[PDB]
Amino acid sequence: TPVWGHTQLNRLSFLETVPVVPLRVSDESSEDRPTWSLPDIENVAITHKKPNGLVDTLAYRSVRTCRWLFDTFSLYRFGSITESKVISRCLFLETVAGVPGMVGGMLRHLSSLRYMTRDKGWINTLLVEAENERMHLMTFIELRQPGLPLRVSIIITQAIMYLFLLVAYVISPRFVHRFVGYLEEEAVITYTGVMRAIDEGRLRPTKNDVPEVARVYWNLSKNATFRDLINVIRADEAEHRVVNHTFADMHEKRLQNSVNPFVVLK
């Protein structure tokens, strides 16, 4: 269908159409949407992959070290579970889950560009992750819109974590791939916790008007609940878990410059 041809290609600008384009939520993201079956991802589960040497271990300790600081500073520990404290958590953390796949994608892109070699499907995997995690932010910001302290600390988090991820990937992209491996091992835990807690009525959900952004992106029928939204977000993290653990492994074996195994499922 698209009416994009040479009369449009010889234009100077389309600045003028800008005021008459609708803001339909589906545009927020590309069409590489994830498609999960609620009854199948329902049985997603908590795994843990053994660290192989020093770098796998450094990686695993840092994620533990961070889970522990975060969990304590943020008071997630004592008090009952709450809607408020779940989404506030997911909101802040989702800002930093978006970074990794954009540094890997972006650097593997640049490498492809300077030794003029073929990437074999790695770049388009990482950037859909980055995107897919950015859409995790976009959903929770429909649910809780935070205030000035939490926002200022999100900005300093990105400054710090952009710098670490960036310079970690240049020196050991296995490290960073291992690190998201384990990062997501914790993401999966935290979310099955939230579903379990709904199922045992300890956190019975108030936000069931699932946002339009999330309905389009996960193709969810109108009658979907917070628990159904959460699960799918948890299913996404199990994928990333396997992808960054498969990617780390591949490096360990010196298979960086080999086909991205997840291209086949497509």
Annotated binding site: 94, 133, 136, 184, 237, 240
Burial class (CB in 10 A: 0-12, 13-18, 19+), 12: exposed
Nearest Cα residue to 98 out of 139, 64, 62, 129: 129
Give me the count of residues in the chain.
Answer: 266
Residue ranges of the alpha helices (H) in the chain? 6-9, 38-41, 54-73, 83-97, 100-114, 123-143, 148-171, 173-199, 212-217, 226-252
Q: Does 147 bind a second copy (CB under 8 A)?
A: no
For the segment 128-147, give every residue that binds ligand OH (CB under 6 A).
133, 136
The helix/strand/coil state of 257 is coil
Is residue 29 within 8 Å of residue 213, measured between CB atoms?
A: no
Least separation in angstroms between CB 181 and ligand OH: 12
For the segment 176-215, give every residue that binds ligand CHW (CB under 6 A).
183-184, 186-187, 190
Q: Is the dihedral of CA 52, 57, 58, 60 positive or negative?
A: positive
Nearest Cα residue to 47 out of 232, 175, 182: 182
List binding-site positions for Fe cation.
94, 133, 136, 184, 237, 240
Residue 89 interacts with which of ligand CHW, Fe ion, a second copy, none, CB < 5 to 8 Å by class: ligand CHW
Two tokens at 226? 């917070």
Near Fe ion by CB under 5 A, which window of 20-28, 68-76, 134-142, 153-161?
134-142
Q: Does 137 bind ligand CHW (CB under 6 A)?
A: no
Of the residues 99, 102, 123, 187, which one makes contact with ligand OH according to CB under 6 A: 187
Q: Does 106 bind a second copy (CB under 8 A)?
A: yes
Nearest Cα residue to 128 out of 258, 262, 227, 264: 262
Residue 186 interacts with which of a second copy, Fe ion, ligand OH, none, CB < 5 to 8 Å by class: none
With respect to ligand CHW, which residue has the nearer C-beta, 162 or 262? Answer: 162
For the segment 18-77, give every residue that binds ligand OH (CB under 6 A).
none
> How far is Cα 239 from Cα 251, in angstroms, rounded to an integer?
18
Q: Does 41 bind a second copy (CB under 8 A)?
A: yes
Q: Does 54 bind a second copy (CB under 8 A)?
A: no
What residue type is assigned to position 162 of the chain? Y
Near a second copy by CB under 8 A, which window of 66-74, 123-131, 193-201, 218-226?
123-131
Q: Does 157 bind ligand CHW (CB under 6 A)?
A: yes
Near ligand CHW by CB under 6 A, which window of 65-73, 168-176, 209-217, 255-263?
65-73
Least separation in angstroms between CB 20 and ligand OH: 30
> How far is Cα 185 from Cα 243, in angstroms, rounded to an integer?
12
Binding site for ligand OH (CB under 6 A): 94, 97, 133, 136, 187, 237
